[PDB]
Amino acid sequence: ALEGTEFARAQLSEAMTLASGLKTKVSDIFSQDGSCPANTAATAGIEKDTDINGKYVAKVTTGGTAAASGGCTIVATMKASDVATPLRGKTLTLTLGNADKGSYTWACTSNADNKYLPKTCQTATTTTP
């Protein structure tokens, strides 16, 4: 008897797995400098604030307005990658509202192929071109 795989591109599993996995990573973002900067003090003496992993297939950075409560709007991206969507993964964004005295909160805001009705994850703002 022989063995082997068939699916391989189990994007379904990786999809959900990537969702919760993203929350954990983003949760660290605000936890990085205990604030919400924009890689202004990263890629210099840190190994977390400056993510953007892959060969230009992942544009992730910190953002928002916080430094005592919780207001980090991190925006991730996928350019010329090979996961989700037929062309590109597009951009995505999440928010942190822990308040530094509550129990952590989140606000989804994705911007990757949104033709169907909205739910949980909204559409990212226009942002600069």
Swiss-Prot record:
GO molecular function, one term: glycosphingolipid binding
Biological processes, Gene Ontology terms: biological process involved in interaction with host; cell adhesion; type IV pilus-dependent motility
Keyword Cell membrane among record annotations: no
Cystine residue pairs: C36-C72, C108-C121
Keyword terms, alphabetized: Disulfide bond, Fimbrium, Membrane, Methylation, Transmembrane, Transmembrane helix
Subunit structure: The pili are polar flexible filaments of about 5.4 nanometers diameter and 2.5 micrometers average length; they consist of only a single polypeptide chain arranged in a helical configuration of five subunits per turn in the assembled pilus.
Protein name: Fimbrial protein
Organism this protein belongs to: Pseudomonas aeruginosa
Portion held of the full protein: 36 to 157 of 157
